[PDB]
Amino acid sequence: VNSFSGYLKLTDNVYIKNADIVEEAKKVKPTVVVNAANVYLKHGGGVAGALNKATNNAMQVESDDYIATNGPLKVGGSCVLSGHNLAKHCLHVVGPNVNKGEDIQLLKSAYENFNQHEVLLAPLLSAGIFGADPIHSLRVCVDTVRTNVYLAVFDKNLYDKLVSSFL
Numbered sequence: 001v002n003s004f005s006g007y008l009k010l011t012d013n014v015y016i017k018n019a020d021i022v023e024e025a026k027k028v029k030p031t032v033v034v035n036a037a038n039v040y041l042k043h044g045g046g047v048a049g050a051l052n053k054a055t056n057n058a059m060q061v062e063s064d065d066y067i068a069t070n071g072p073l074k075v076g077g078s079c080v081l082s083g084h085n086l087a088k089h090c091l092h093v094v095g096p097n098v099n100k101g102e103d104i105q106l107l108k109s110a111y112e113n114f115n116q117h118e119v120l121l122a123p124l125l126s127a128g129i130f131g132a133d134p135i136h137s138l139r140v141c142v143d144t145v146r147t148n149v150y151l152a153v154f155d156k157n158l159y160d161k162l163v164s165s166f167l
């Protein structure tokens with residue numbers, strides 16, 4: 001038994017809720033929150049900018065030190081850093097950027113990072129809101145992640161669409 005509340009069950013191990021991941025993190029304080037990162041750990045908008053803002057920029061300060069030491073992540077890769085005031089740990093995961101021409105198959109590699117953690121609070125990666133992109137993003141999550149993942153979907157029309165379309 002864990003502390004996540006109000007989630008719909010998609011499969012044995014995947015749960016979903018129309019929620020803002022930042023509000024979910026503050027309320028639950030999970031062991032792992034996933035950030036939808038870029039390779040530079042530049043947290044400007046979306047999940048990353050909102051998580052970072054909620055840490056009062058401490059996530060960005062830690063991230064810049066990480067990059068200065070280690071260089072950029074790989075697309076499809078990840079690193080574990082502090083969760084600051086939001087979680088014990090933040091797993092920064094880089095999904096492919098299709099508007100950069102980055103291979104859509106890297107999305108499966110990105111989700112494979114989740115399997116190194118028993119339970120995670122996470123957003124959809126390389127999904128966005130419009131088109132078939134988000135549907136297929138959740139399809140890859142379900143078919144790749146084997147650990148217990150609690151998905152917070154910010155857009156309610158998208159949440160409703162995902163639940164109603166999920167096979």
Ligand SMILES: O=S1(=O)CC[C@@]2(CCCN(c3ncnc4[nH]ccc34)C2)C1
Pocket residue numbers: 019020021022046047050123124127128129134152153154155158
């Ligand atoms: O939900 S979406 O339509 C699926 C793709 C999307 C892109 C923007 C950032 N998103 C978030 N997801 C969950 N919590 C969030 N808090 C702040 C942003 C955010 C994910 C929106």
